[PDB]
Amino acid sequence: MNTFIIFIILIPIVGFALLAVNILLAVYKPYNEKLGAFECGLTSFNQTRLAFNAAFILVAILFLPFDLEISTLLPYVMSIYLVSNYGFTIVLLFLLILIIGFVYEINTNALKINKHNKPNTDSLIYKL
Amino acid sequence: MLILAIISLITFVSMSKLSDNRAIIRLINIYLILVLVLDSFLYLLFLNNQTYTVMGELLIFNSFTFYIDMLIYFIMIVISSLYGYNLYNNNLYKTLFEPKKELIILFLINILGALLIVHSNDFITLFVAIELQSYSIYLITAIYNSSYKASKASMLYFFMGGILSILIAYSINTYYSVLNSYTLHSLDSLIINTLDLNLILIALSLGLLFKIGIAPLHKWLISIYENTPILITIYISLIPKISILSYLVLSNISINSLVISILAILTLLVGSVGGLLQIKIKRLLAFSGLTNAGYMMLLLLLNNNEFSYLYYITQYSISHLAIFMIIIFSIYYINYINNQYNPIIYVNQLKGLIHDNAYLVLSMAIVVFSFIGIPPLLGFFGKLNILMSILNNGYYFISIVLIVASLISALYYLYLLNVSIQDKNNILINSNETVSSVLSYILSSLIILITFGFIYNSLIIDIFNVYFN
Amino acid sequence: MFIGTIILVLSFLGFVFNRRNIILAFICLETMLLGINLILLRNSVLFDDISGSLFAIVIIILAGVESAIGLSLLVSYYRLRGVINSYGI
Amino acid sequence: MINANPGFWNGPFRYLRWSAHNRPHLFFAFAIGIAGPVAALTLTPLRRKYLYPDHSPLPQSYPLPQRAREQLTGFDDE
Amino acid sequence: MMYLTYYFIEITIFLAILCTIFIISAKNPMVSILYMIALFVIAAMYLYLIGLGIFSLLYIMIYIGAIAVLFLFIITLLDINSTELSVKSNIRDLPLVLISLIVLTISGLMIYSNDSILINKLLEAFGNDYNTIITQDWFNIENTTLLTTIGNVLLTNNAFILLVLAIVLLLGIIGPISITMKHKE
Amino acid sequence: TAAGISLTGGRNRCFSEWQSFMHCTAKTDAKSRAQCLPNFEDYMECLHHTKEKARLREIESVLKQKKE
Amino acid sequence: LWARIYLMPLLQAEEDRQTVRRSIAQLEREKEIMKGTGFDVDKSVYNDGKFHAPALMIPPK
Amino acid sequence: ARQGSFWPVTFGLACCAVEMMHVSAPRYDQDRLGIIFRASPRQSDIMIVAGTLTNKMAPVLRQVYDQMPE
Amino acid sequence: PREAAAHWVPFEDKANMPDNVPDVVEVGATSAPLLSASYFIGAKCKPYNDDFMLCREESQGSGAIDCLKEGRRVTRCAVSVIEDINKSCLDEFRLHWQCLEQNNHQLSGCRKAEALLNKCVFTKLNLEKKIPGLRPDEEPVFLKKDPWIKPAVDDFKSVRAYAEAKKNGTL
Amino acid sequence: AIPFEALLPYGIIFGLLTAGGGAMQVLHVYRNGGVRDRFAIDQWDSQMMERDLRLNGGQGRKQVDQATAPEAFKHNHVWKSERPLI
Amino acid sequence: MIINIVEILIFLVCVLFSVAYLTVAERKTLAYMQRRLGPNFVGYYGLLQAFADAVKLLLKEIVLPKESNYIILVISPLITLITALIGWVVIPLGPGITLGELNLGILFSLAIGSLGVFGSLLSGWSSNSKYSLLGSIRSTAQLISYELILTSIFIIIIMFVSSLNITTIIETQRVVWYCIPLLPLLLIFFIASVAETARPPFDLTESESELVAGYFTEYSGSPFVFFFLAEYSNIILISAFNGYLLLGGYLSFNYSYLFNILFNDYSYVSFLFEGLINSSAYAIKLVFLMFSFIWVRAAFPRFTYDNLINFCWIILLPLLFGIFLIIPSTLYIFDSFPTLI
């Protein structure tokens, strides 16, 4: 029984203290419209999802590889002395190869949100 | 050169439009040609079968692997030519065959994984390379995302390849649990006959083999080859097979296995019988590839199999490319475009091709009779060398099965030729559009190789006897 | 050895006998990789060997990339279809 | 439009001026990332020659002598 | 007091079986993802138990922190219909499920031993009876831990696989953009 | 490549037996390779502890039934 | 590191003497557990003639 | 506690909301007495009806009121 | 070897050493005084230590049973060094290792006691501290006048003793 | 600084965390026996601390400067018998 | 284990009451910046405002709407609060004065911070509302996007000290605090801290959603108290990360001279004064960083989602992928790769 172990178990199996205090002390007599949700608002049986832009999911899909890159750099910073001037060059090559993909990401503009209703920029020409 | 190509093309494609991808493919095709021309003198390193261990002991370089790499470059050259050069300068052929922006990069990364599979000496390299192949080839199946069939195939292929990769990893980690090693060089006579080790090794072999359609796990890959675009099918039906079978031939893992014999017999029978009622072209060719994969499974039981495997894989690659190119050339004369992705599906759409293009049908006949194994063509010498090896090593029932499969497969190989040399009303009399010069030359060169390569067999054997013995 | 084989086998069965979801297929693949890594790391500890831990961290990286690619492919499938149903992959 | 790209190959120096003015977030990241490897290649030998050389290695294990055994005495029993 | 913490490996095995069953069984796939997270927690526990807390934390920050997050991210954004676990739909699987359970478990336990006779190959796998002696040496002078050694071998003895994982991560960036994004021209 | 390396960066638990076996393999040819059978048995014994487990089973059984 | 190097042999000599003591005591103990049988306890499970500590034991209780 | 944490719901409809805002301004600081105006009624204890109530707005007022916890 | 994992019960052994193995006294010093006497042990026990390690290496597996005479010599040489310290140089030694205890066994927090102890042992026992492997160009860190790294609180008794020794010319 | 009423809560935070750190320093020292804590301990220091526990009568971090050990140190040795990992 | 319980209870009490008074500090500092004063009426000088808020909330109904989920809505605050509080176990207030003196402390911090995203993820699932499920998505995107920058700064610091022991990372800064060589990284880490805490100017989805009927945290009662505690504890913990990475943690001027003047031998008064000085330094740094959070809330307007994602992924990460190359190069040029400990 170390203080670390005591704390990390005690926080979860005690965190419901004020939860129970609130459940026992506080009123609970619901209405229909107190179980409701808004000022106005409704939706028929149309669908279960909304159409979303690609960047919304691409940021999450690209979080995985860049996070794995930055987490794969942890062995290097914990081995930096032992891999002296060899692993340094190796991790630099690693970072350059992974910067090429970041360059691709920037040049494609993959996290940009595009706008449909463009403003009209075409001249007004009158057939005489 | 491949990594230089990848790191160059990523930048150059990011900083380029979609109007430039065809020219990019042309550029990298010429790059691969220059590499295969100028750097191919490295064969002299492998004189008297000198073998080298590189990157610690993570890679192995010998004549076998150098040859497979030259072959994969040749295949990539042809497949890139099909994307970089328009067959006809019409709106139709600018709607059917357009390269997508990232396709060339994914092709080169898949080629990298292929070569790091064949060059692998440690299982960590093998697994990293298997995954680099399979992820890239998922994305290649999926890049034509405006196709329902292709997306569906992408996802099926992801899941099945994932499961088989789980199997490969289980095999590898069990091998490590037993021997505390990831290297097959750790094995010798004593370790094989002292430890029972065949379950692990055949589990690895089957996890690798079911990834190329070995029965009873063939239907999924045949559906994937059917449902993908034609110019994607031509790649995804060939290069993984070369890579994995070359690894399994270089690694002597299944020298007298009963399970591999049984499953190879099953592959032969299925790949011969199931192709008889196929009405579609790509499924027929998929079952053809299945039975050829069976013929090449047979030489995983030999321990001296380099010549037979290299001859057969080279001739099968040439024949595969030639037949897919003939089906690609036949689209100008078919009377009904089926899809934007598979413009030709059914074999009866080739009816009457001899009256529109007769020499295309001559090419088809040459390739069909090489598949059947008719002399003096190249498939005959392939089958002959395989039979030589398997009868020298004592597989006498498998030989009769091989003959019977060679005979049953000829029916669905001849379906194509038969319908092609049939008569048709509404023939072609004139056309002002001409097919490409480069692709015509490539197809003609493949056909001439199939037809006249037997002249050099003596020379090839004399070179093999110096570089592989 | 036991926990990993158990997780692997149950994940494989929950992949094979899944008539419900595609998310369950993804989950079963990830849990299969987990089970392999746990057997691998137990052997790494018993032998006092680093190759197992190296292979394990490599599997972590590769499984992350696998998840990213798989959930991009699912998103393409959903681009075209709009609903990922009980069946049909 | 107002300050569009002039192209690197239609002039490097003008392009880099344009980048510093209109794309600093990329230009100065490029500079930071490029100045490390190049300095590592070019300045390190000057440092070894004129400032101080590289340090001598740390032991990393028991330095087992590369010799044959020698007969000793002292601190024997009794 | 001594043996109160003895069966903490067996408890993790039990909890893992439970969480896998709940993954297969949960009605909403969000709950299946949460039970997968709980299984990762159990695995991280077991890894601490056998002396690999570095891998426990790596798992917590990678699997739960990114992969499970992405799973939740996609099920929050995509319509993934589900058929509930039923007896009219899934009870047909019980014979093959049981046959495969027995066969696969027994083969997975037999595959690890080198003994020739087949029944003994399982009996050695269940031969976990005798304890390991942990003696102390004084030869390791440095403070090298598991992460330090992983870095050392990965950046010196195994630099090639790192510089190939770089291209794997490049795929992880370049594929999803090719598949999800539509390039204008 | 990473063979024979510990979790702490040094020699593993069963290095010496492996190194003896590999010395004997370097001495030998494929026809004289059967001389290296005891060395490989030692390496595998260090790995998996089968013979020691059987020995302790015998000891325990003598402590088990010959007393009760 | 050099302090720890100059202290290694002392501590390892201590550990080696205690290893010898316990490895021999365990054999003399198993001799008295295996009195009236032909079981050779000193027969090593390793074919080399090297000294091997037990590496496994019966649990205490 | 009910006094010193006095959280009304943001129901300003008309020109009395100007005076509410001035009660949040520096001269009269509502926050000195514990007052924080909360957007959603689920977090609120008070409803200050500051503005005319139109017949097109009364259902909304009653919905906001009924959404308030006791 | 690895550290224990997931459960482990200590167990002792009440058996005595065999009689063909002569008896040898143990060293009996704890962590800190031994860290303080490490360099003086290395100055005197170099041949015996390296002979112990060479006979271990030459044995190739049987070092525990083949190296007992050699390890006994190592133990006796270390005991002699620490007996000489206690007989002659105990106050400075105690300053040094108490200073080590209040720090984290960092020798950088103990230089003022280290100087007195090194002077004492070099004059009385003729053993000097030397960090090998260096060049003539490199400065040993225990002789630096103004280091970057200093203790949070320099030890009180050591400061008073250093001051008195500088006022009495012992340093 | 002018607004003391705004700095009073910061002063309470400061005082609480300061007093917490001080009391924790005192409790750590009481736990150790008049010696500051050890930190960043590796395998070597753990094994040396166990050895110290063998040379003192289980008295924690108490140090001994004598040149010969008691004769209990010869029979006080601990080997650890570990559960089988599964 | 008696004194272990005592130490834990002291630490818990001080941390939680610091949070409760950081709420008042926020309000009063923002006020005096805005030429007002408040809260000053609900205790003497406003020192019971947070406890009044808590006691009110703990007597309110725990209404859960019709088409919502009971369990998720109720435990998401609690999971968020647990993860916020167990990150304090590794925070040192002295040389080794910690609850958890883990040699993998940085990774514990960086891994327990990885779990704070699940609160915002699961909040959206506690209703049958399709737009809150998108607000969930936007918030989670922000959090996972700035996690990379925090982790990158962690690794850039660990390039200087090859250890994951927080006390060692602090004790290496007796020479120089790492805010001096890496002053821009201090700005970047503070910016990413404000963005991870979802605090203004990065309060998009809270601001977004109070407009709409949904997409924010419409909790009542005890969930609401737990969320406030989580927020105002994660603020102090991310400022703690700032502290022990860049601002030296508990370090100050060298007080050896002063202690040798005041004392003659180690006593418990000596140790208490050492601890008070060290934790005083740590606390004044935390106070400054919390004041900076409040200042930034007072000064600037708000971002949009596009501007924010663009900020992150196109301005900040390029600089850091460059710094990954420049720091090891600077260590190679001068032969200064750091040793373990």
Ligand SMILES: CCCCCCCCCCCCCCCCCC(=O)OC[C@H](COP(=O)(O)OCCN)OC(=O)CCCCCCCCCCCCCCCCC
């Ligand atoms: C990947 C998805 C994730 C799920 C993975 C599940 C766990 C993996 C299980 C193991 C790996 C799968 C292996 C695939 C099957 C093919 C294995 C194989 O072919 O190896 C067989 C091999 C012998 O074959 P071979 O070397 O070719 O011939 C020479 C013979 N001297 O080697 C052998 O001789 C095998 C040894 C024979 C013992 C087989 C054990 C079966 C025992 C089952 C008994 C069950 C009890 C009775 C029935 C219960 C039903 C109620």
Ligand SMILES: CCCCCCCCCCCC(=O)OC[C@H](COP(=O)(O)OCC[N+](C)(C)C)OC(=O)CCCCCCCCCCC
């Ligand atoms: C190599 C590119 C392959 C691409 C496909 C084209 C086939 C080229 C065949 C040359 C092989 C060689 O000449 O080599 C013989 C090889 C081994 O020799 P090597 O180590 O590879 O040295 C070759 C050095 N080169 C690269 C400079 C040439 O033995 C074999 O088993 C080859 C079996 C293949 C049989 C197919 C014959 C096709 C007919 C050839 C009509 C000209």
Ligand SMILES: CCCCCCCCCCCCO[C@H]1O[C@H](CO)[C@@H](O[C@H]2O[C@@H](CO)[C@H](O)[C@H](O)[C@@H]2O)[C@H](O)[C@H]1O
């Ligand atoms: C954590 C301790 C446990 C008990 C929980 C305590 C809950 C109390 C939380 C209060 C924290 C401060 O949070 C609060 O700050 C100020 C208070 O003026 C509010 O701000 C409100 O007041 C005005 C000031 O006139 C602002 O301009 C702003 O437009 C808003 O109307 C914030 O909208 C709210 O976030």
